[PDB]
């Protein structure tokens, strides 16, 4: 996909994997749609086959650190642990290395980011599903606030994401968008480590 011309949107899911991730992957599969999963390293240990699904079925795996700590609260070595422990978990699980990282709570800063070997990927559309856990509100906010180049934040922690996705994909397609991984979204642009990006 050429997102320089084509109207692209990236669906992203934080804080997984968990008990709903496979249903989520099933729904995404049913509508031939890729997504980007910013995974928690602590959770990855328990879900190796599910991470293999992400690779096998066209999705992108990103790092969300290991135990979801605000990285700006940490020391240099603390940040090292969060990055490296998560990478090891992802490599052991799926045989790949993430190429992007999303900082917990969106919290970051130049002095910290310089320690992160990947582009920092934020978002421009917060579905707020972490507060309301409501599938229809997730769809409404994602649909109405998305624009070409948007990155939509959702959470793989709760049933409402599973219930939201079939409708969310349908409506984004009907609204003229092509759904892509974060990699595809930034393909061709200057997408470099230790920098933060919230939109193409
Ligand atoms: Ni998170």
Numbering used by the authors: 42 to 241
What did the study's authors say about this model?
CE4 enzymes are capable of removing acetyl groups in chitin, chitosan, and CHOS, thus converting GlcNAc (or A) units to GlcN (or D) units. The protein has a somewhat deformed (β/α)8 barrel topology that is characteristic for CE4 proteins. Next to CHOS, ArCE4A deacetylates chitosan, chitin and acetyl xylan. X-ray crystallography yielded two structures, one for the substrate free protein and one for a complex with (GlcNAc)2 bound in the active site.
The structure of ArCE4A without (GlcNAc)2 comprises residues 42–241, meaning that no structural information was obtained for ten N-terminal residues (32–41) and five C-terminal residues (242–246). Note that both the N- and the C-terminus are located on the opposite side of the protein, relative to the catalytic center. The structure contains a Ni2+ ion coordinated by Asp56, His105 and His109, which comprise the metal binding triad that is conserved in CE4 proteins. The Ni2+ most likely originates from the protein purification by nickel affinity chromatography. The Ni2+ ion is in an octahedral arrangement, involving three water ligands and the metal binding Asp-His-His triad. It has been proposed that one of these water molecules, coordinated by Asp55, is the catalytic water acting as a nucleophile during catalysis. Superposition of the two ArCE4A structures reveals that the water molecule coordinated by Asp55 in the substrate-free structure indeed has a position that could allow it acting as a nucleophile during catalysis. The other two water molecules, which coordinate the metal ion in the substrate-free enzyme, occupy the same position as the oxygens of the acetyl group and the hydroxyl on carbon 3 in of the sugar bound in subsite 0. It is worth noting that the superposition shows little difference in the conformation of the above-mentioned amino acids.
